[PDB]
Every structure is written in C-alpha cells, then in structure tokens.
Structure 1
Amino acid sequence: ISAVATDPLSRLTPRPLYAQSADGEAFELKKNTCVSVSDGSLLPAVDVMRDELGTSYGLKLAEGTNCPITFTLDENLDVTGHVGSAQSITADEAYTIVSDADSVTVKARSATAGIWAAQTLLQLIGPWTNSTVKLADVAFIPAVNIADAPRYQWRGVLVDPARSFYPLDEMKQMIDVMSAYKMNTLHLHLSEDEGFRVEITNDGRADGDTTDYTQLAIKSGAISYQSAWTSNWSPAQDGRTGYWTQSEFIELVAYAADHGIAIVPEIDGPGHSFSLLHGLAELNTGNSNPKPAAGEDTPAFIQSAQGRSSLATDADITYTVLGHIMDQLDGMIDKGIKASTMPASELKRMYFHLGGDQLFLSGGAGNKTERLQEYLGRSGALVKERDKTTIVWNDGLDAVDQIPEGSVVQHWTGNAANNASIQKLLNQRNGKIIMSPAGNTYFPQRPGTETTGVTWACGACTTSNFYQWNPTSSAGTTEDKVLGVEDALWSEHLRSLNDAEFLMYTRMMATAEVGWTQQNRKDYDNWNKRVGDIAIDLMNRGANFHKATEVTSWKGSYAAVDAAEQKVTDGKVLVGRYAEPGLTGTDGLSFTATYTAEGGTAVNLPVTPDMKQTYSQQQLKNGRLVVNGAHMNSIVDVYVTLPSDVLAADSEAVGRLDVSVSSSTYPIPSDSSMSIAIKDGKVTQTWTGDERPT
C-alpha cells in the first residue's frame, strides 16, 4: 500500500451544502495564472489565496482580464436548488465553484462569500498550501461542482485577553485559522475583574464629560489574573499584562475584516467590572463595590476584590463612561474597516455585548436584581441609541423586561430549551440566541482524559462533545431565532498562543462545521476522518493542537521541496518535508533516497532528517501546568547529500530524485519523485512532471 492525496472533495471542512466531482482533468495553476474579478470588493478573496500560494507554489495570481480563474459578484446568486425541505441557509454568504481542466468559475453573493470560496479552493489544492517553503509539485484545482452557504449567520470565537493579554501578532494567527474554517465573528472579552485590554482616549467625549479615560488602559492594562490567588494546576506565571493601543486595535479590526471576520466587543457589567473601578477614579461612586480604602481614588487590586465587583448602577457617570467606551470602540471599528478593502455593509456588526453578569451586593441601596435591572435598562438604552442590538449572557435575563426588544442572549449555563427567561426573550420580546453551552463550546474544558484542565462540563469535552449537538434543538427554538454559535477561549490558565491553540484545535474545526454544515449533512465519523489533513495544514501554519486519542485519522504526509530555492551546504540540500503529528524524534522514520542521472543508475544518497521540536503532552511541575509544555513536533526537513562528482560538474546535469519514507507510527509509506537540474554545485530547477518546464 502507498500514501496518496485524499480525494480533494473529501477534505472540505466545513462540509459544504453541495459538492460533486465534475468530468475530466484538474486545472493546473501556473506561476503566471491570473484571476479575473467582476468587482474590486472580490480582490480580498484573491489576496487570501496569494498570501498562501505565493510562498508554497510561487504563484503571482495577478488580477487580469479573461483569466481562467474568475470571481463574479452576484447579489441574486440562488443556491436554493440545493436546499432541501430539511435544510436552512443564510444566503448572504452563498458561493458556487464550477471548475474543469480549463477554468475555475466562482460566483459569490457577497465579498465575504468570495473569501469563503477562496478558503474552499485552498482546501481543494490541499494541506501544504501554508508551506513556509516553495514546494516542487504544481498546484491543482480539481474539476468540481460546489454550491455552498452556511446554516448559521453567526460563527464565532470569544477571546479573553482580559485574564491574560494576547499581542496583536497572536490575534492575527487566531484570525488566520478562524477564517480558514469560515468563522466570521471574533468576540473580544475586553474587560474583566483582572484587566482592561484596549486604549480609551479623551477625544470626542460628550458635552461636559471631564473623565480622564487614558488612566483605564494605563492602570488596568498593568493587572492580570494572579497565580497566587489559585491553589490548583493553574500556571505559576500570572496572566500577561498589556493592552492594544488604538492603532493596534484598528489593525486587529482591519486584519479580521480582510479575512471576513467582524469584531464584536464586550464590556462586561455590572459585575466582572473590577478593571473599570480600578482604572477610572470617576466610576467609584454611588453603590460601586468594593470601595477604595482610606482616602484612595481607586480600589486596590487584591484577592478580596475578586468576584465582589459592582459598577455604580445608580450613578449617571457609569453610563457616561460606558457611552464613551462604546463610541470609542465604534470609531476604532469604523477606522479598521476603512483600513480594510472589505465593505462596511458586511463587516460592521451592529451588536454590542453588555455581558450582564451579576454584581456583588455589599451595601443597602437596592437588591442585586433591581440594580441589574437599572444597569441593563440604562446600558441597553445606550446600545439601542447607537442603532445596535444588545447581547447579554444568561445572567442578563434577570433584566429580560428592561433590555431593548429584539435583544440577544448568549447561552452558556444550563438547558436553554427549558429556560423560562430565554423562551420569554425569544417568544415574547422578539429576541435571538447565540449558543455557547459550556459542554459543547468552552475551550478550557479539558479535551481529553490524559489532559489537565477544567472538568465540570463533561469531565473531558472532546471533539465528539464539540461536534455532536444541534444548536437549534439545544435552544428549543426555530432556526430564525438562532444567530448561531461561539467557542469561548477564557484565559484564567492561558499564558501563550501555543497553550491557547492546544485547547482551540482541533475542537474549533468541529464548531466551524456546527456553524456552517446542514444538520442532515453532519457525520462525526466523516469529520473525524478529515482531521488528519486539518493537522497537516496546522503543522504548516505552525499552529499547536491537541493530539486527541478519539481522532482515528492522524497521518504522515510527504511533500517534495523546490531545492532550486534552497542552499547546498557541504553537499547537503533540502529536498522534502515530512509532516506527522506526534513524532518524539526521527529514529522511527526510515528514508530511502536515490539520485538517477540521465545516463546513470540509482545512487543511494545519505538522508539527514531534521526536526527542530519533538512532540510533548502537557507538563506539570510542582502541581502546576508548565507554559508551552504541550507542543507539536516540527515538520521534518529531509536533506540529501548529493555526490561530490555531481556537484563538481561544470556542465548542467539532470536527474530524478526518488525519496521514500516509512514511519514506525503511521503504516502507509510515502513515495516522492522529482527531476532536478544541477549546475556549478547548485540546484537550478526542480519539476514533478514528465516534461521539464520552460
């Protein structure tokens, strides 16, 4: 038996609405293959393709006229011929692909649908398109007929930088993988008891508002989740401190927009609000809790404060401050979308997340409920007057009557179908639901019984728990009331992108399928079989992931490297890469490499496999998780040593380089053949065809 590429259509995640093999040969991408667009708004889709294929395959994908690859914008694109009695789509995100040996024809209902088409094409090309080095093979798009649209319009990840900051470059790496699986929403949990993570300035304050907002990021940027206030397996390291400057936050929005992802900000209140009291002297007033000590302007960041926070629900300044933070986030979001090449009509998400987590009661100026009803009535009024829809967590529905009509609950705790408050919001107050039930969507829930993490929701919430649910059924409502789903990355215990990606992947790709794929097109075993290729692409991106035991498709894959762009050092040159999750070293890999000259016989070449990092599960030291203890092995660089007499040839020499890999941990060996040209001890050209390209 011998390793081959999976049937390209078999790879697609999320599973599209409709996908069939068309007749005949695949389309071959050439260095100079151009792309035609009907509209400038579709260039961002072409850019997503060029950003990968420029590096992996040397593709220019220049914009041209009468190109074999076309993106056409069709606001009336009709995929309903593929929507059965049992199916439901949000058509704004619909696209089609019709391809053959000669052409690839994309229609997109929106600019965002263009990017989804591009992500599908990059999956069809295969799991090496994020290669950091130019590959020797040419790229092919199979002859296919695809009609696609998502079930749910809202397919998101909550990121919590408030417990522990994530620098902009790490947020971009999350957006990359979110976009790759057609996630369209990045919910930013900007503020908590333990931090505030975006700069707020004093530009454009309301008349007579003399609040100094600049202290918010300066004081509450400098705090984070404290290891010392834990007695469990939480890392010895405190949360990362810091905040995004306005220009960093504008760049975050712009980058998200150019990948089809809208920003949804959350400023949580009246509870989980200690960062606001700690940052703004002005918010310490009326029934705020806790109070600053002996002649202090702001309460101290100390263990007794944790879970005991309340904004002043009875004070005008609370709502002045909230209004200005909302205005400033709105301004930065508009500036981010302006900096993108994507349309505001698609990427400006007219929602604001108030949170609504219960405040702590200390004094006697109201009951917890009454204060929450004051706070969400008044803060709900701010959102409505900015032409936005309010979102609250389950706790916020103690104020279901006070929040505006048409408000949204983000469900995480208990059975939504049986929740009187949720059913009243949906049924009597024209509301809608975003589904984040902890047991199906909370990344800190440990992904396996061998792992260390949060256990309360499932014991271990595996890819099975993340895949095998129906958000509409779980909400006990109709399709039209379900906006969709969000995963949650809470950062009490997270200190790095590597440790976040351990929890996020591959479970996020199950959530992506829940958000996108039709309920009657879902098949956990089929999704499980696609994870092998998902992992090969994550390894190419340098993204970490949990090597879950329930995944049956972990595989090795070999790709020939274009040695023409690699240096020969002491006769050694990089000719291949071998990706296989879980390698603890290279000694379980058996490589055979031969060079066969024109005129020659097979010459065995010494093979030098090189793997920078080895695979490790999580590591505990003194009862606590080590930061980055769980890490994936590197892709193996496969070097051969070329013979001295081939490298000393004053005349060009052509030969065939055949590389075989057998793995102790993956039972299907790979075979690779490419032709190489060598002159003056350097590889000048490689090719995998029967004909040398000219």
Structure 2
Amino acid sequence: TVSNLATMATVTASGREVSSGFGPELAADNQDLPDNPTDKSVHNASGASRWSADRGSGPWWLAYEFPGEATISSVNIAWGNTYATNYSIQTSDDGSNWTDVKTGLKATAQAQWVKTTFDTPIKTRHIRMIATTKSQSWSLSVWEMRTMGTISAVATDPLSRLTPRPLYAQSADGEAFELKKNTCVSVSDGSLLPAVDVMRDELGTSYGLKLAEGTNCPITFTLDENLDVTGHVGSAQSITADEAYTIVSDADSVTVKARSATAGIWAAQTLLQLIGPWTNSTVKLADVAFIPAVNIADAPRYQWRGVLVDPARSFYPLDEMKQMIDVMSAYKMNTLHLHLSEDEGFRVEITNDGRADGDTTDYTQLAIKSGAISYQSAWTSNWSPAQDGRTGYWTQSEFIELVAYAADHGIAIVPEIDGPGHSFSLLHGLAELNTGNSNPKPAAGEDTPAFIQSAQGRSSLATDADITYTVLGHIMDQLDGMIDKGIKASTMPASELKRMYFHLGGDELFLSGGAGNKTERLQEYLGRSGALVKERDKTTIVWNDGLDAVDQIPEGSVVQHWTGNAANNASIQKLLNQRNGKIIMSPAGNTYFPQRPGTETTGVTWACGACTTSNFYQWNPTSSAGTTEDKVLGVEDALWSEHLRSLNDAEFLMYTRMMATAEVGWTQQNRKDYDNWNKRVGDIAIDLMNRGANFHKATEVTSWKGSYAAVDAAEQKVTDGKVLVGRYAEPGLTGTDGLSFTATYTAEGGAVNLPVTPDMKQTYSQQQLKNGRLVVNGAHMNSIVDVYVTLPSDVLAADSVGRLDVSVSSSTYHHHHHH
C-alpha cells in the first residue's frame, strides 16, 4: 500500500515567481487538478494549487525532504501551462548532494501527468525534480509532484561517518556537545595527553580550539586497564581488548574511557570523525564544532593493522612519512612496517656506537654508500617513471623523530632488514660483508660489488660467515636504541609502543638467478638470524617464501603471507599448527598498493588485473589464512616503491583502499558491509582534500560528494575589497564553471549582491604518460574551491552587525548557507 508522501515532506525549490502565492508547497498538497486546468483564469487564479518557479536561466528544481527514509515506487508530476521539456529525478541522503535516478524525462503538453516508475523502489530521505529546459519563457508550472511510497520514521544517524565501523554505536538523548575556544580536557594520566594533542593539532586551526589540559573539564579521558566492552562482543565476534575504548556524550559532557594510551588516540580519532570532515581545515571555519550525543563501545578485531612502506626503492623524507602516519592513525592503523633495506637502497644511518667486543666493522659506510643508490628507471622496459628512485636516508635524529611521531599517533615501528636475498644494499655498503658464500662478488681489486643491473635479484649475504650475524645484530641493536629514544620522546608507554617483533624478510632469494643452494642458504641464515631476534626478546617475522626455514626459525615465529593461497600452503599450516606460529595477512590481491586500483589506471596487473576497493574490502583474513582466529595477528597493506617517486603518487595508490584495509583490520566480520563502507568514502575524501592528501578517484565508489564550509572572514585578509568567506570541496572538478555561486550581505535594517570569485588552484587529473612512462605527480586531486566575495565600499569600511548568505548550485549539489 503506497501513498503520496508529498503531504509530509519539507518542500524547497530553486525559487518562486511571486512571494504571495504559487509556492512550492502547492505541488505537495495532494490536490487533483481543478476543472479546465489550462484556462488562464484557472491556471492563474491567485490561489491555484501549483508551484510557479523562479525565472532566469535555470535549472529549476523542487525538492522534498521526508521525515524518515521514504521507499518510493513512482513519481507522478502534473505539469502546468509551462512544462519541462527536459528534466531528471535525483535522490539525496544529506539534502545537498544529488544523484541521478531517472534522466531524459520530458513533458509534452500542458496539464499533463508524467509518471516515472522505479521497478525497484528506491530508499531515500530526499528527492527532487530538476528541469534544464521548459516549453515557454514563463515560470515553470507544477500542479502536483506526487512521490508514491512508504515511509520509515528513522532519524538521521549521527554516527554514519565512522570508519572503521565500531563494535557498538548508538545515538544518545539530547543536543550535541558544543566545543568552545576555552573548552578544556581532563586526563586521568599523562599518557593520554598525546590523544588530546591529536585533537588540538586539527581543531586549533579549523575551529580555533585551545583544548588545554585542565581540571574538572567537561571532556575527560580516563585510562582504565580493566575496561570491559565484552557486553557488546557476540558469540560470533572477537576483539583485542587492549585497544578498547568507550565514549558517552551529551550536551554537557564527553566521557572517554581507554584500556590503553593507544585506545585514547583511537577515541580521539573517533571524536574527530564525529565532529566531521572539515576538522583538518587549514583555515578557521565560521561554524562551531559539535560532538553529537552518543554511546560507543569499540575495540578492534585484529591486534596488527599495518602499512608496509618501502623507502628502500625510493626514499621518503621524514615530513612525507609524517603525512602517511597522520592518515594511518586517522583510520586506527597501529603498525608502520619499514622495509629499510633492498637490492637498491639502505635508508637509515647506522653508527659505530655500541658495537660488540671485537667488531671493528665501519657501519657509517652503509648509509653513505647505499643511501646514494636507488631503483634505476634504465633497468626497466615499461611504464615506470623516467626518474630513478629518490636517494637519501633518515639520519639517526630523523629516525628517532619518525619513531616519536608514529608513537604520538598510536603507531609502532616494525623494522625489516631483508635477507638473505634482497640484500645487495648491505653488500654494496659494507666491504666486511663481502666474504664466504656472499653473491655477487666485488670485481678484482674492489672491496664492494658494483651497483649494476646484473646484481639485481642475484644478491645473497654470506650465510656461512660470522660477520653477517655480527652486522645484523649491530643493526638490530641500533634500531632498538633509536626506537627506545623515539618512544621516550613521545611520552607513550614503551609497554604499548615498543613492538617486540623483528622482520628478517627471507623473500625471493635468487629470483633472477644467483649461486644456488637456495634452501640450504635460507635454513642456515634464518636459523642464525632468528636466534639474534630471540636473544633480543623478540618474535621473528618472515615472508611466506622463506618458510623453507620453518623448522630453523624459533618456535612461535610469524609468517607474513603475500604469495599464493595460505589455506593450502603446507609450510604455513606447519608453522601455525606444529610450531605455535601466527600469521600476518598481506595477500597481494587484497593488500598490495602497486596493484592498479582501476582498469583506467597504469600500474601492476598480475594479482587482480585491477585490485579495487572491492578486492581490498571483500575478504576475511582468518578464512583466507585457512586457520583459527587466535592464530591471525592481522593485516598489512604494502607500499612498494619500484615506481613511486613522490608522496602524491604514493597517496594515489594508498587511498582510499587503505581505509578498506583499516575496516578489515578493525571491524567485526559480521559488521562488514562493502556498500555501507562505499557510502562512507565521500566524506573520507573531503577530509583527505582538507589534509592535502592525494587519492585515486575510483569509478566503483558511488559516494563522491561536494561539501560547502563557511570560513571565519574575521580571520581572513581583505585585499581590494576581496575576502574568503567559504570553501567548496568536491573530488574530480576540472574547473568551477559547473558551479553557480551567489552571495548577499544584509546589515541589520538592510540584502545587497556580493560578486563571487570562485578560485581553485589546481584541477583534477588522472595519471599522465610521456613517452610511454608515467609522469611523476601526473595524477593529482583538484583543490578545495576558495569562495571569495568583493565587498562594496560601505561594507568594506563598516565596523563589527550583519548576515552573509552564500548559495552554491550545480546539477549534483545545492546548498544555501547563512551566518
């Protein structure tokens, strides 16, 4: 049973002919046409039951906001004496962003019903008719827009933005908490100050909040090592309780409980998602920030939620690593796996401080010599950039700073020094490692092997030589010392942030050829190296193609799975079932960022053809591992850098797929829904535009949206009458001509027109090729649009008193703002 829901709708329109009658609400009054509806005395009787639109060039639109989710079967429009010769019907969840549901619609006569049927009824809070052309110069005329269906009186979900989707989240009673400039925060413990710092780092700029630590503040964080959310853990669910938090908020208070300092940062990240996708605004906004009234209880499914970054192929400066850490933290990733060494580079300084007794190795050569090499474009015959990998390395100071910044965002460092293959940078850097069964050998009269194409994929450390293990042990000791110093600088607890794991690699030894004995080499090397990790009170990690040494690595070692089917891999099952091992899941087709994210893009094709947000989301790491939940540590994305030369190009591949892995890492298997995640991507993107982070504008994402935010003009420079009053963020804009801006000013008493200048520094571009090779930074997002107005002299010269109105319209967006 359907009804005309027009009669319960809140009705808006592009405009109206006259202020006094023919209002848009007269399309929504469920009245049959009067007798003789085309007669002018009937169509133009002052009380005629019809909308008469604004004039001008259009488009002209009529929008219904339902008090609930409407399930709409059909729209039947009774057109008046001026009818739409071309129109569409669009839907909106938010009332501002519109999506086509029926296009190519036409009326063909006066006083004509045009019925548009949805064979599958559509569920929507908003619907509108938008018309581009009409039958006469007169105002478009609508007697009736009947929207036939049923309605469910469900309120908007103030928690709909959250990613990852929490364990438990429900709206609470009453108004939102309004954040004020001097709103203070109380913590139970100093280790929670980093969580408040994360909030202040965004909100200080975007909303001018001090968020000072105070006493008896209305926002509190409490560390409770016994926090229990198991009430919300169902028999088919599984959590890591150490990262549990709760939030309980109302109009007067925001109360956070955290099981760990790390969980306090997760709580802060949740609060920043609730405040909305403008918290990283580089400019003070005019709107106040609100935390809606909520009850949240949250913890992750998996304890290990990571990103591998490979600076070894192409270096990433410290400031770029910080921008990665910011977004990793924003999605509750807790692990930064650094692939520090490769055939093509070594990216951290190792000193001669604290060497073992008898060790006179000169470690300073390693960064000096092997920092200076990188992936060679000339050794590629493909679409890889013409530019070689970036060279360089983090100094110990910068590496300690990297550790501290990661820790202050809830992220631990997991170092990898790959061997015995993928190790040419070590041989190239340290004369002393060129001994025993190492490969390749230095040319006659040389103390280190030449960085030439024939070395690549043919490297082996000397698995038979004591110096190999001396060197590895020193590098482990140096990394540990730097990690300890960075955690100390962060103030986060070492018990939380010092990840007692070391990644030995073990992958693809002699992939391109080399000296043979592949298996006997893995077994000797990973046996002795594993013993180094164990004696340092750590758990060994190896890639799955190093489990040739499953029996020689320590009991309880971890496999990082990337290649083939883990569930059928005998050596993985042996580790997990016979050697109390655990698994980190990085199957290439679900987690490898170089795998091209769309069929329109240029990139690696082998794992999926294109591994999209669907491939990154729609998998279950435990069933992919073919093991039990208890044996799965979690997941890591991989950013391999053979082809990456910039943070912009890395972020193209990382985002938004990384936010799918974040949900796989955190969200319960039975709470995952790819369509629900997909709907959340639009605001994920508005926040990335505010951060200045790049992202692939994937075709399978269907929530790309615009968002208008008013700017606090009091903090903006006026130049020759021109001042920034608004920003408009929409991924994919190639220019501003699709957008119509209008602004008016009213001093109390007075509305005058302000001419608007929209200004977008950069346009959207997909990847660019030159001579068959990707151009570095070819794919880049458009800028947020700056919305300037030019003030008249009387307004320019007035003191501080008035109301600014700004309206933005496109075929897919409409918003009117006032302050």
Q: 2:458 touches 2:513 (CA, 8 Å); kept in 1?
A: no
Return the alpha-carbon distance in structure 2 between the equivalents of residues 526 and 660 of structure 1.
30
Q: 2:205 touches 2:283 (CA, 8 Å); kept in 1?
A: yes
How far is the alpha carbon of 1:663 from its aligned partner?
A: 2.4
How far is the alpha carbon of 1:8 from its aligned partner?
A: 3.1
How far is the alpha carbon of 1:259 from its aligned partner?
A: 0.3
Return the alpha-carbon distance in structure 2 between the equivalents of residues 59 and 227 of structure 1.
47
Secondary structure of the 1:591 match is: strand
Q: 1:417 touches 1:475 (CA, 8 Å); kept in 2?
A: yes
How far is the alpha carbon of 1:66 from its aligned partner?
A: 1.2
Distance 1:428 1:659, change over 3 A: same
Return the alpha-carbon distance in structure 2 between the equivalents of residues 585 and 268 of structure 1.
46
Return the alpha-carbon distance in structure 2 between the equivalents of residues 457 and 378 of structure 1.
33
Q: 1:35 touches 1:64 (CA, 8 Å); kept in 2?
A: yes
Return the alpha-carbon distance in structure 2 between the equivalents of residues 242 and 591 of structure 1.
47
Return the alpha-carbon distance in structure 2 between the equivalents of residues 2 and 320 of structure 1.
69
The answer for the alignment partner of 1:376 in structure 2 is: 526
How far is the alpha carbon of 1:395 from its aligned partner?
A: 1.4
Distance 1:379 1:594, change over 3 A: same
Return the alpha-carbon distance in structure 1 between the equivalents of residues 511 and 741 of structure 2.
67
Q: 2:457 touches 2:513 (CA, 8 Å); kept in 1?
A: no
Distance 1:496 1:364, change over 3 A: closer
Alignment TM-score, normalising by the size of structure 1: 0.94
Question: Where do residues 237-256 of structure 1 align in structure 2 (5 Å cutoff)?
Answer: 237-256=387-406
How far is the alpha carbon of 1:234 from its aligned partner?
A: 0.1
1:616-639, Cα deviation, whole Å (9 max, x unpaired)? 000000000000000000000100
**Which structure ranks higher in relative contact order (CA pairs < 8 Å, sequence separation ≥ 6)?**
1
Question: Where do residues 339-418 of structure 1 align in structure 2 (5 Å cutoff)?
Answer: 339-360=489-510, 367-418=517-568
Secondary structure of the 2:417 match is: strand
How far is the alpha carbon of 1:359 from its aligned partner?
A: 2.9
Return the alpha-carbon distance in structure 2 between the equivalents of residues 538 and 363 of structure 1.
43
Work out whether 1:622 is the aligned partner of 2:776: no
Return the alpha-carbon distance in structure 1 between the equivalents of residues 202 and 383 of structure 2.
38
Return the alpha-carbon distance in structure 2 between the equivalents of residues 588 and 361 of structure 1.
52
Q: 1:566 touches 1:573 (CA, 8 Å); kept in 2?
A: yes
Secondary structure of the 1:594 match is: strand
Q: 2:439 touches 2:515 (CA, 8 Å); kept in 1?
A: no
Distance 1:366 1:225, change over 3 A: closer
Comparing 358-367 with 639-648, greater Cα deviation is found at 358-367
Distance 1:576 1:366, change over 3 A: closer
Distance 1:286 1:5, change over 3 A: farther
Q: 2:458 touches 2:514 (CA, 8 Å); kept in 1?
A: no
Return the alpha-carbon distance in structure 2 between the equivalents of residues 503 and 366 of structure 1.
36
How far is the alpha carbon of 1:294 from its aligned partner?
A: 1.4
Q: 1:361 touches 1:367 (CA, 8 Å); kept in 2?
A: no
1:230-261, Cα deviation, whole Å (9 max, x unpaired)? 01000000000000000000000000000000
Q: 1:289 touches 1:360 (CA, 8 Å); kept in 2?
A: no
Distance 1:364 1:504, change over 3 A: closer
How far is the alpha carbon of 1:5 from its aligned partner?
A: 13
1:469-506, Cα deviation, whole Å (9 max, x unpaired)? 00000001111100000000000000000000000000
The answer for the alignment partner of 1:637 in structure 2 is: 786
Secondary structure of the 2:210 match is: coil
Work out whether 1:486 is the aligned partner of 2:633: no
How far is the alpha carbon of 1:226 from its aligned partner?
A: 0.2
Secondary structure of the 2:428 match is: helix
Return the alpha-carbon distance in structure 2 between the equivalents of residues 358 and 56 of structure 1.
47
Distance 1:475 1:363, change over 3 A: closer
Q: 2:616 touches 2:660 (CA, 8 Å); kept in 1?
A: yes
1:211-230, Cα deviation, whole Å (9 max, x unpaired)? 00000000000000000000
Q: 2:280 touches 2:690 (CA, 8 Å); kept in 1?
A: yes
1:575-602, Cα deviation, whole Å (9 max, x unpaired)? 00000000001111101111111111x2
Distance 1:5 1:439, change over 3 A: farther
Return the alpha-carbon distance in structure 2 between the equivalents of residues 367 and 361 of structure 1.
13
Return the alpha-carbon distance in structure 1 between the equivalents of residues 345 and 662 of structure 2.
29
Which consecutive unaligned segments of at least 5 residues does structure 2 have? 1-150, 814-819
Q: 1:358 touches 1:372 (CA, 8 Å); kept in 2?
A: no
Q: 1:168 touches 1:248 (CA, 8 Å); kept in 2?
A: yes
Question: Where do residues 155-554 of structure 1 align in structure 2 (5 Å cutoff)?
Answer: 155-360=305-510, 367-554=517-704
Q: Which has the higher helix share?
A: 1
Work out whether 1:648 is the aligned partner of 2:797: yes
Q: 2:175 touches 2:293 (CA, 8 Å); kept in 1?
A: yes
Return the alpha-carbon distance in structure 2 between the equivalents of residues 461 and 5 of structure 1.
36
Distance 1:365 1:465, change over 3 A: closer
How far is the alpha carbon of 1:2 from its aligned partner?
A: 20
How far is the alpha carbon of 1:665 from its aligned partner?
A: 5.2
1:242-292, Cα deviation, whole Å (9 max, x unpaired)? 000000000000000000000000000000000000000000000100000
Q: 2:309 touches 2:338 (CA, 8 Å); kept in 1?
A: yes
How far is the alpha carbon of 1:647 from its aligned partner?
A: 1.8
Return the alpha-carbon distance in structure 2 between the equivalents of residues 664 and 171 of structure 1.
39
Distance 1:361 1:485, change over 3 A: closer
How far is the alpha carbon of 1:650 from its aligned partner?
A: 6.2
Return the alpha-carbon distance in structure 1 between the equivalents of residues 316 and 521 of structure 2.
33
Which consecutive unaligned segments of at least 5 residues does structure 1 have? 667-694
How far is the alpha carbon of 1:648 from its aligned partner?
A: 2.7
Q: 2:540 touches 2:553 (CA, 8 Å); kept in 1?
A: yes
Secondary structure of the 2:306 match is: strand
Q: 1:8 touches 1:126 (CA, 8 Å); kept in 2?
A: no
Distance 1:596 1:2, change over 3 A: farther
Return the alpha-carbon distance in structure 2 between the equivalents of residues 37 and 574 of structure 1.
37
Secondary structure of the 2:152 match is: coil
Return the alpha-carbon distance in structure 2 between the equivalents of residues 96 and 312 of structure 1.
52
Deviation beyond 6 Å, 4+ runs, structure 1: 1-6, 361-366
How far is the alpha carbon of 1:360 from its aligned partner?
A: 2.7
Return the alpha-carbon distance in structure 2 between the equivalents of residues 335 and 67 of structure 1.
32
Q: 1:270 touches 1:358 (CA, 8 Å); kept in 2?
A: no
Alignment TM-score, normalising by the size of structure 2: 0.80
Q: 1:8 touches 1:125 (CA, 8 Å); kept in 2?
A: no
Return the alpha-carbon distance in structure 1 between the equivalents of residues 685 and 417 of structure 2.
35
Comparing 61-70 with 437-446, greater Cα deviation is found at 61-70
How far is the alpha carbon of 1:366 from its aligned partner?
A: 7.2
Distance 1:583 1:362, change over 3 A: closer
How far is the alpha carbon of 1:642 from its aligned partner?
A: 1.0
Q: 1:200 touches 1:246 (CA, 8 Å); kept in 2?
A: yes
Q: 2:456 touches 2:512 (CA, 8 Å); kept in 1?
A: no
Distance 1:207 1:361, change over 3 A: farther
Return the alpha-carbon distance in structure 2 between the equivalents of residues 263 and 2 of structure 1.
48
Return the alpha-carbon distance in structure 2 between the equivalents of residues 4 and 609 of structure 1.
37
Comparing 363-372 with 6-15, greater Cα deviation is found at 363-372
Secondary structure of the 1:487 match is: strand
1:50-82, Cα deviation, whole Å (9 max, x unpaired)? 000000000011111111101011100000000
Give the paired residue count: 663
Structure of greater Rg: 2
Distance 1:362 1:595, change over 3 A: closer
How far is the alpha carbon of 1:367 from its aligned partner?
A: 1.7
Return the alpha-carbon distance in structure 1 between the equivalents of residues 585 and 513 of structure 2.
35
Return the alpha-carbon distance in structure 2 between the equivalents of residues 241 and 394 of structure 1.
29
How far is the alpha carbon of 1:645 from its aligned partner?
A: 1.5
Q: 1:528 touches 1:553 (CA, 8 Å); kept in 2?
A: yes
Comparing 137-146 with 357-366, greater Cα deviation is found at 357-366
1:529-577, Cα deviation, whole Å (9 max, x unpaired)? 0000000000000000000000000000000000110011111110000
Q: 2:439 touches 2:514 (CA, 8 Å); kept in 1?
A: no
Return the alpha-carbon distance in structure 1 between the equivalents of residues 156 and 387 of structure 2.
43
Q: 1:531 touches 1:554 (CA, 8 Å); kept in 2?
A: yes
Q: 1:361 touches 1:368 (CA, 8 Å); kept in 2?
A: no
Distance 1:597 1:485, change over 3 A: same
Distance 1:554 1:4, change over 3 A: farther
How far is the alpha carbon of 1:649 from its aligned partner?
A: 3.3
Q: 1:352 touches 1:383 (CA, 8 Å); kept in 2?
A: yes
Q: 2:712 touches 2:725 (CA, 8 Å); kept in 1?
A: yes
Question: Where do residues 607-618 of structure 1 align in structure 2 (5 Å cutoff)?
Answer: 607-618=756-767
